[PDB]
Paper text:
Residues 297–374 (the remainder of the linker and the CBM73 domain) were not visible in the electron-density map. All LPMOs have the Glu (sometimes Gln) which is required for enzymatic activity, likely by coordinating H2O2 and reactive oxygen species intermediates. CbpD contains an analogous amino-acid pair Asn46–Glu174, but notably the two amino acids are swapped, a feature that is also present in CjLPMO10A. The maintenance of the polar interaction between the side chains and the proximity of Glu174 to the active site imply that Glu174/Asn46 may also gate the access of cosubstrates or electron donors to the active site when CbpD is bound to crystalline chitin.
Numbering used by the authors: 1 to 296
The structure:
């Protein structure tokens, strides 16, 4: 039993946050979806009778949850799942650190990687992953409750990806699954660039709708994201964050919030401090406001 800690699997992550008080939107939406109980049984994302035929026992659309109704909340298709940014060493490899709360005999440690062009918003299916694993570990030694394996990192990848780790025990027929959300650096520097400030002059009436349009370098419609503000989200120090959360969730092309040293953009409960970032130049954005229809 266990999962990856370096990098953190999607389940280890949500849990290091604090199941009883999630911090990231994805994790909040995960506990609201499948309960807090799954986040504690974080070691049992498994299939007792895989026998090496994971493709026949893990249903499409529930890979992150091994089709276990308990972990239903892990299969959410979102663009904001917290993710580790990874890169190779001087030789192109990556040292994975798997945490085994119960060291059992090992058959293999297979690493799958989403195809080029993976779309976070489509629930992870087997065919969204590349056909054969990019790294196959066949013997390990324990070291302070973790299995450490050097792996050749796939080259040419770019953007947010999911590494799918399968651990097939040798002593029994069961295996464990780990959706690791990673993020690759392209062949060209892709630093988040700020475009404007998602500023709020005064509060908006409850039920009004707030729309953010994004235009590319050629003034073409790039993306659109709308959000009707329920009571309590219409505050001036509230709605800019409410919109910045709907944006980050549905999109990886534009992110609204605060940039940190690592390179991540997380919003804030601020009236002015929320910023609109895009990984290309010359982009522009507009904020439109539909007011609640009046009349009988
Ligand atoms: N077990
Ligand atoms: N691919
Ligand atoms: N959504």
């Amino acid at each position: 039993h266990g999962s990856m800690e370096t990098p953190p699997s999607r389940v280890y992550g949500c849990f290091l946050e604090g199941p009883e008080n999630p911090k990231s939107a994805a994790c909040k939406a995960a506990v609201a979806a499948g309960g807090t109980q799954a986040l504690y049984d974080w070691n049992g994302v498994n299939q007792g009778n895989a026998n090496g035929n994971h493709q026949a026992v893990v249903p499409d659309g529930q890979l992150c949850g091994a089709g276990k109704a308990l972990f239903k909340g892990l299969n959410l298709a979102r663009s904001d799942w917290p993710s580790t940014a990874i890169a190779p060493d001087a030789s192109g490899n990556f040292q994975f650190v798997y945490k085994a709360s119960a060291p059992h005999a090992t058959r293999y440690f297979d690493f799958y990687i989403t195809k080029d062009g993976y779309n976070p918003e489509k629930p992870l299916a087997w065919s969204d992953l590349e056909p054969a694993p990019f790294c196959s570990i066949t013997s390990v030694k324990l070291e302070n409750g973790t299995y450490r394996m050097n792996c050749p990192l796939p080259q040419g990848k770019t953007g947010k990806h999911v590494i799918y780790n399968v651990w097939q025990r040798s002593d029994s027929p069961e295996a464990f699954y780990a959706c690791i959300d990673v993020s690759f650096s392209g062949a060209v520097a892709n630093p988040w660039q700020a475009l404007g400030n998602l500023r709020a002059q005064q509060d908006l009436p409850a039920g009004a709708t707030v729309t953010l349009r994004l235009f590319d370098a050629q003034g073409r419609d790039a993306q659109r994201h709308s959000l009707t503000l329920a009571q309590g989200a219409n505050g001036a120090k509230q709605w800019p964050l409410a919109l910045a959360q709907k944006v980050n969730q549905d999109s990886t092309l534009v992110n609204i919030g605060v940039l940190d040293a690592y390179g991540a953009v997380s919003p804030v409960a601020s009236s002015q401090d929320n910023q609109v970032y895009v990984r290309q130049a010359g982009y522009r954005f507009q904020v439109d406001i539909e007011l609640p229809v009046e009349g009988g």
